[PDB]
Structures are given as structure tokens and as C-alpha cells.
Amino acid sequence: PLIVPYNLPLPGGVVPRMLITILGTVKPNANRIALDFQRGNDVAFHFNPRFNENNRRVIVCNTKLDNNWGREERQSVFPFESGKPFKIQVLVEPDHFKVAVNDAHLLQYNHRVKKLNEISKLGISGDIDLTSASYTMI
Template identity: 50%
Template sequence: MAVAVRRRVSEPMIPYVGTIHGGLNPGEMVVIHGTVSRDADRFQMDFQCGNSNTPRADVAFHFNPRFKGSGQIVCNTLQAEQWGCEEITYKMPFEKGKQFKITFLILSDKFQVAVNDKHLLLYKHRINLERVNTLGIHYNKVKIQSIEFVSVIPSQGLQPLSLGAVLKNGEMEDNPKKAELVLPYIGRLHTPLGPGQTVVVKGEVNQNANRFSVDLKPSDSNVIALHLNPRVKSQVFVRNSYLYESWGEEEKKLPDFPFSPGMYFEMIIYCDSHEYKVAVNGVHILDYKHRFKNLSEIKVLAINGDIRLLDVRSW
């Protein structure tokens, strides 16, 4: 997938209230770069249904960092001039005097928010997304460098990763129209793996998720060339290979665990000549040196665990 900035607002005056041309649609993002003032006590960003002051326009998503004490993020919805039940996140990724990047990912049932490329929170829609047409940024304790409205563009030349789901008898279905994204999922790569090829897995982590796995392996073999195993409850991302009837040494070190219950993710696996490079939601998170060297034998992707599988692709 590729992205395109369909509109950019540079250095707006705060308070800012601006029309979201074309509204908000699932799969789009609003990316805001700014700086928190050194004396900030709070600021807010509101996805609104219009810009009326009297009566006050409904606010579909009120995002309100507050710096009192250890800090918190308050989220809410305003309907008919009445606030609903607050949802509070006791995690403060913003620092006074420091720059930030907020990414609001628009999904069909919720907003997904990341700060400085790290997942922060989810907020389920309480107002129909089709009504949202205005962005408001309030309190002059924040300076905004840019607001970007980003559309996702389907890349050309992509091929479905799987030629089918595994049938009950263990054989592969060769009609891609019959492929179903059910777990456990096993699919054939469009072409054998090799340097320069990319595999993309899109899904949503279950709310009560324990773990899930994404494996690249040769056909007709119990060998696993690449085993990616995020363990959500323990916040550990295990990488390994299963060769010669045994597991190798686990690789676990990461600065940050990139998954959270309920979050949407796009995992990109890029095969280089010496290693795999793995990114989650556009952020590179790890490299894994090839332990299974015969890359051209790797033709199968297996996925299982506590996720809802949405799409699989390769090119």
C-alpha cells in the first residue's frame, strides 16, 4: 500500500477550526506534528460535526491530554451539548517543551491513536463517522507545525498472497476466490520467497489476546524459516526458526512492544539477502538474520492465534 497526503495545513493559528474536505473515511489518517509549550496544562483536538458555537457542534472524538500530576489523556464525545462517559488513559507520551507526532488512524468502528509512532489508545465511534467534517485544536499551549490528511492508495501489481485456504483433508484449494481468512490459516506465496520480496499481513488483535504467530516455511515440511510470535499478555515478541526437528535460540529484545489488545495492525515482512526486516504500522521494529538459507524453498505462510485476520498479500 502507498499513502498520499491529500491536504496539508502548515503552521495554523491556535485555536484552529478547519473543514475536513471529503470527510473522514476508514483507512485514512490524520497526522499532526506539533510542540507542547513549556507551561502547558492541557490541550485538545476535536473531530467535530460542524463548527457551530451556539448550539455547540457535536464532537465525535475529543482527545484531551492533561498534564496535571503524572498526566492523563481524557477522551469523550459531545452530543446535544452533553458530554458522555470519559475514557481515561493514564499514560502520558507528551512532554512539555518537546515535539510530538500524533497519528489518528480512522477505522470503520474506532479511532486508533499513536504518538511518536507508538500505539497509545483506541476510541470506539459513538457518532456516525459520516457526520464528522471538522477538526478543532484548542488551547494555545500547543504549537502545530502541520496537519496532514492522508489517504491510503492501493499499490499497483499486488497479488493475493494465498491461492486458497487449507481444506479439511489438508490439501490446498487452488481457486483464489474460495480462499477464506480463517484461522489457522495456511496459504501459498504467489512466488517462492527471495530477496526483494514483501509479505504483508493485516489483522486486528483480539481484546483478550494471549499470543499469535506468523510463520514462513517450505512446502511439505515442518521446518519454519521465520517464526514471528507476539505474546500480548507478557509483552514479548519472540522470533525463532524450527530447523532439524528443534527450535533454535529465541530472539526477544525490542525497545517497545508494538501490539495492544483491540488494535489494527499491518505487519510488513521484507526479505533481504541476509535477513528479514519487519515493520508494524509503518514503523521498522526488528531484523532477523536468515537461519534457513534456501529462500527459494519458502513457499508457505501460516498464521494462527488470537487475531482477526483481514488480509494477506505478497509482491
């Protein structure tokens, strides 16, 4: 087991062809999960499954600059399930982060923070038991 919130350093920042894989299990009474790719205090890519936003399950994605959240990108496809194991894969492509959950493509998030090699940490938080968090080049 890995302790949550967990920080995964991304040495030298992200680059296209970098694949991040996260394995965990959603807790039974889950409310929220967050992945935060950070550039110092800024959040280049926030990926945030919400299990009960006005009785809806939604994934909210956004960027935080100078402590301000920007325009949200919302996805109603919701592949997480309370109490169940999951795999998140985040592939850095030249123009977007590409996310798959349990081997099925979920969404893409266009790069708003363009200094990719300054996105040096990934935070993992929320209502999960975290099994593994790693990266490799494809």
C-alpha cells in the first residue's frame, strides 16, 4: 500500500510518450478522487471524479493558475465504481493528456500549461486505496 495523498515526482517534467499508470481501489463510500499534475503551485491538469455532485457522477477536469481555476471540461462517462479496483493510464501526447480507465479511452485534455518539462509532480488524493503509481516511456 501507498499512503494517500501521494506525491509522484516526475523527474525533468513530462514529455510526449510518457505513460503514467495508477492502480488502486475506490473506497466503498467514495465522494471524490483527484489527480493533480503540478507546475509549482499551478495545476496543469486536474482530473477529478465526483461521485455525488447533485446526485450525478461526473469527471471534472481543469487547470489552476495563480490560485484561480479556469474553464471546467466535464465528462459524464464515469468508469469508476465504489469499492472496485481500477487502473488509470495517462499518456502524454504532444498536444493533450490522453486518459484511459480500465483499458478504455476516457478523455483527452488539451495542454493549457505548455512548459511540459516544468510539470514536475503528480499528486494523487481522495477516496482510494492506492496500490501503485509509476511511469514509463512508450
